[PDB]
Structures are given as C-alpha cells and as structure tokens.
Design a protein around this ligand. Structure first.
Ligand SMILES: [Ca+2]
Ligand SMILES: [Ca+2]
Lengths: 146, 147
C-alpha cells in the first residue's frame, strides 16, 4: 504493498506559475489530486491514472516526480498494517490542456492560484511541502527528468 | 552532503496508560518534540541519540526505538543550500526509568507528560501527529522496533 500518491497540477502563465487546487464537497478542505495504488500498479502508474480520472485529461499529459514524500496514518485507508503508508508526490503540466474536475465528494471544483495563495488554502502540510519543492524547481527550471 | 533531520518522541509507561513528553519553547508559544539535524558523518541513529542527550541532559544509555513515519521538510528551515527538501526520520525514547533525571536546555521552558489525545492538541505539524499515532499504536500492541 500500500502507498498513496499526490499529484499537483500546474500551468505556466506569462507572468508566473499557477497551481491547481481542488475543493472537497464533504469538508472545507483544499487539496491536490490523491489516491491509492491499485492491483499491481507501479507508483507512477497510480499517479497518471488518478490524474487522468480526476481531471478528465488526455493520455499524453506531462508528469514529473518530486522528492517530497510523507507518511499517512493507514487507518484513513485500511484496517490493516502497516501503521502508516507512504505518500509519493508528482506534478502534472496542464499548460494549454483541456480538463474538468470529476464531480465527487473528494472535489467539486478546481482553482488556478498563485504559490502564495495555494499555501494559504491547502489543508495538509505534505501538500504544502510538495508545492514548495515544485515552485522552487519551476522557478529554477530544475524539474526532475521525466 | 545529504542533510537530514531527526524527530524523537519521549514516552513513559504509567500504571494506567502511556504518557508522551512534549516540550514548550522558551522563545515562542510552541510545543514540539526533540529535533535536530545530522552533523559530520553521523548515522541517523547517532544523530537521534545525540539530540536526545543534548535536549534532555541524559546519562549515556537509554532505549531508543525506530518509527516508520517519515516526512520531507523545506530545507530552508535548516539550510541555505539544496536540497529543496530534506527527510525527517522519527524515533521514540523510553524514559519510564529515568524521567526524574531529565533536565532541559535553555531552548525549552517545560517538559509536559501528557496523554496521546492531549499531545495531539498541543502539536502543530501533521508530520509529528503522524509519528505520534504510529508510536501510540505500537505501544498499545507491544510492537516496537529498537533503533
Ligand atoms: Ca482519488
Ligand atoms: Ca536540537
């Protein structure tokens, strides 16, 4: 095995970068794309899938790894050990791409926001750290190779 | 390099339950665990030991335990240089037999021994709450792993 993935949507604008934060319907929570590994999926396979599903994307979406990862208490997901499961992070570039959020309790809207505004909106520390890393990498044209 | 951080959660076994040791900062209204960064050529376990000794002014030999909970931290909290984020590894220390010997450094104003639920209320960072959850489940289950 169990693991989770987190996927941050971003776009390049003329002035800055913006980031795609999602708002849940069942709680006042801003988060990113998230979900669990299924069947025999590799980690990056899980991230691509959840991205394509949650946002209704085209299959050739550009996706990048991030170093940031964190543990999640496993009871959020499983009755069983392990006690905690890892959350692996990625980012997806939706510059000039069609999308629309899949309406669900996990998210009813998406909003494109500045780094600073996403930091104020985001519920979870793991999301904020992952975003920090992404923003730094974008600014420095220093993404991990994909 | 490869900088990293450690987190160390003190705990004690009482007649009733387990209690957890949280530290209040001298210079801010902030409650935290033992924390510090790797120095020189330290193994991560050696950093955890050192930081625990520095912060709790302990003699040489105490039982440390490893936790699976891990988190990345914006390295800017700690360093001026890459990497962008560094890992934080977590641990726990049993002070059931030596809690009377504990004295704090000037960085802290109080060590408070509190229940699980009370500790969660004091804490700020998801990463610390997550480590504490794991510790608490492991104690309850008698399922610990020594550092
Ligand atoms: Ca999902
Ligand atoms: Ca320290």
């Amino acid at each position: 095995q169990p693991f989770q993935v987190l996927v941050i949507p971003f776009i390049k604008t003329e002035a800055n970068y913006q980031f795609g934060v999602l708002h849940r319907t069942d709680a006042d929570v801003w988060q990113f794309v998230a979900g669990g590994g299924e069947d025999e999926e590799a980690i990056s396979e899980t991230a691509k899938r959840e991205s394509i599903e949650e946002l209704n994307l085209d299959v050739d979406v550009k996706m990048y790894s991030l170093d940031s990862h964190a543990s999640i208490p496993n009871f959020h997901f499983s009755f069983n050990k392990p006690y905690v499961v890892p959350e692996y992070c990625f980012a997806i570039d939706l510059t000039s791409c069609s999308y629309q959020v899949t309406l669900s309790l996990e998210h009813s809207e998406l909003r494109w926001v500045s780094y600073e505004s996403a930091i104020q909106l985001l519920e979870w520390d793991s999301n904020k750290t992952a975003l920090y890393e992404l923003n730094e990498r974008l600014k420095n044209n220093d993404m991990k190779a994909m």
